[PDB]
Each structure stands twice: as C-alpha cells, then as structure tokens.
Amino acid sequence: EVQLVESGGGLVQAGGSLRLSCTASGSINAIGWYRQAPGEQRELVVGIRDLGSTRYVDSVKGRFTLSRDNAKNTVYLQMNSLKPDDTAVYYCNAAKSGNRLYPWGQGTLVTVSSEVQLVESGGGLVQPGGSLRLSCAASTSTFRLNSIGWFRQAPGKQRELVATITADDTTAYADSVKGRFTISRDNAVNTVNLQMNSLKPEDTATYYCTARVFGRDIRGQGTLVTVSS
C-alpha cells in the first residue's frame, strides 16, 4: 500500500504564504488536498477532472496552486494570500473520479493570524513565490483617507511606482508587477493594503506609502521586503 505524509504547514498572518508538501511510497496525478477544522465536516479544496485538469474551490481559486514533481514522488500546494478562514488541517489523499482513497496521513496544521503622516507595516522576509500583505494606516483618528499609491525603492536605485488607487476606486499597476500585486482599500477601518503574490528576488526593496495631502506630498518611513530564500 501507500504511506502518505504531509508537512510544511505553520502559523502565518493575514496575506502571508506557506508551501505545503506531500509525499508517498509503496499514479500521483490523482492527488488533491482536503481541509478540516472542528465543528464543520471536512471538505475538498483541490481535485482532478478525469481528463487531467486541476479544479480548485471557487472560495480559494486565485490563491492556492497545486504543483507536482514526478521525479521525487512529491506533490505540493503553494498557498498565497492566506485568510483566517483557511485555518485547518490539510490532508493529501486522492481526488480524481473513480480511484481508491489512499491511507490517511496525519495532516500538517495551518493557522492564520490577523501633522498628519502615514504608517506602513507588514514588511518582512519571505521565500520566492511567497506572498505578503502591506498596510497603510494614516494615523489621523479618521481625519482624511484620500487617494494613495505605493512606491518601492531598492537602495541606490531610482524609485518605482507600483500600484495606485484613487478616490474613485480605480486601480493601476506597473508592468513590473502586472498580475501579481493587488491593491484593495478596506475602508471600514481607515487603512489601505497591498497584497503581494508570487514574489521574486527582484522585489527586494523598501516599500513606502504616498498620499499627497494639502500642499506638500507626504510619505511614511516604509518597511523592508526581502525575498532571497
């Protein structure tokens, strides 16, 4: 028979990332990931159509990415932009139609935490392919939020504008992050965020927050984001 075992889960915050891996010895194409918490019976998160496609639950489509390496009898599931509601234990038995369920692994656990001037946060170190979430508090006691934008800068190089959101909720991203980055407001708390998926060694920079208030343009001190594994 097969012995399944899965590892790589951990504690992480809003946004954030984690690479779950899984492995077996004793067809690796028929493996998908289940998820279980207490108080609601376990569900399926990723499965396989008979033809060989990889169908993902709509609640997560656009975050979790099933990869595989036949050469190591290993399957993975790269998680980005992790939400609190992703908290549970993930298993690794099969998910193609018409296949026997393999012997249950123990499961790796996955937990997810949570003079006007601006205040950035969230910056940290991650691996290539990871995901962060930066936030931009204004420190005003809700005096004015306005229209903002995020610009980064590696040391000794010219600044780069990455993404912006105006008052009208229009978004524009640079071609250097096209597809990967996503700027959302979250207005209910007077803070504005930037989700950063699929990072590279090339994003290693100090990320700041500009707002252009009355008269002068303003920024915050900005947080490091490093990616070199």
Residue 54: give its domain's CATH number: 2.60.40.10
Token pair, residue 201, equals 């060694």
Contact by Cβ (8 Å): 128, 142: no
Neighbours of 74 (CB within 10 A): 14
Contact by Cβ (8 Å): 131, 16: yes
Whether residues 214 and 150 fall in one domain: yes
Whether residues 139 and 51 fall in one domain: no
Whether residues 107 and 9 fall in one domain: yes
Whether residues 202 and 171 fall in one domain: yes
Residue among 183, 192, 226, 186 nearest 206 (CA): 226
Whether residues 101 and 23 fall in one domain: yes
Whether residues 127 and 61 fall in one domain: no
Question: How far is the C-alpha of 73 from the C-alpha of 23, rounded, in Å?
Answer: 6
Whether residues 34 and 125 fall in one domain: no
**Enclosing domain of residue 93:** 3-112
Neighbours of 170 (CB within 10 A): 9
List Cα–Cα distances, 190 to 133, 137, 141, 193, 199, in angstroms.
Answer: 16, 7, 9, 10, 27
Whether residues 10 and 108 fall in one domain: yes
Whether residues 140 and 209 fall in one domain: yes
Whether residues 142 and 106 fall in one domain: no
Whether residues 126 and 166 fall in one domain: yes
Give the per-residue SS3 of the chain.
CCEEEEECCCEECCEEEEEEEEEEECCHHHECCEEEECCEEEEECEEECCCCCEEECCCCCCCCECCEEHHHCEEEEEEEEECHHHCEEECCCECECCCCCCCCCCCEEEEECCCCCCEEECCCECCCCCEEEEEEECCCCCCCCCCEEEEEECCCCCCEEEEEECCCCCEEECCCCCCCEEEECCHHHCEEEEEEECCCHHHCEEEEEECCCCCCCCCCCCEEEECCC
Show which of 57, 85, 112 is a domain's final residue: 112
Show which of 49, 83, 112 is a domain's final residue: 112
Q: What is the resolution of this structure in A?
A: 3.8
Contact by Cβ (8 Å): 75, 64: no
List Cα–Cα distances, 4 to 18, 20, 76, 100, in angstroms.
Answer: 19, 13, 13, 14
Whether residues 56 and 142 fall in one domain: no
Structural domain count, the chain: 2
Neighbours of 162 (CB within 10 A): 22
Across 31-55, b (16+ Cβ under 10 Å) vs e yields: bbbbbeeeeeeeeebbbbeeeeeee
Show which of 90, 112, 134 is a domain's final residue: 112
What method was applied to determine this entry?
Answer: X-ray
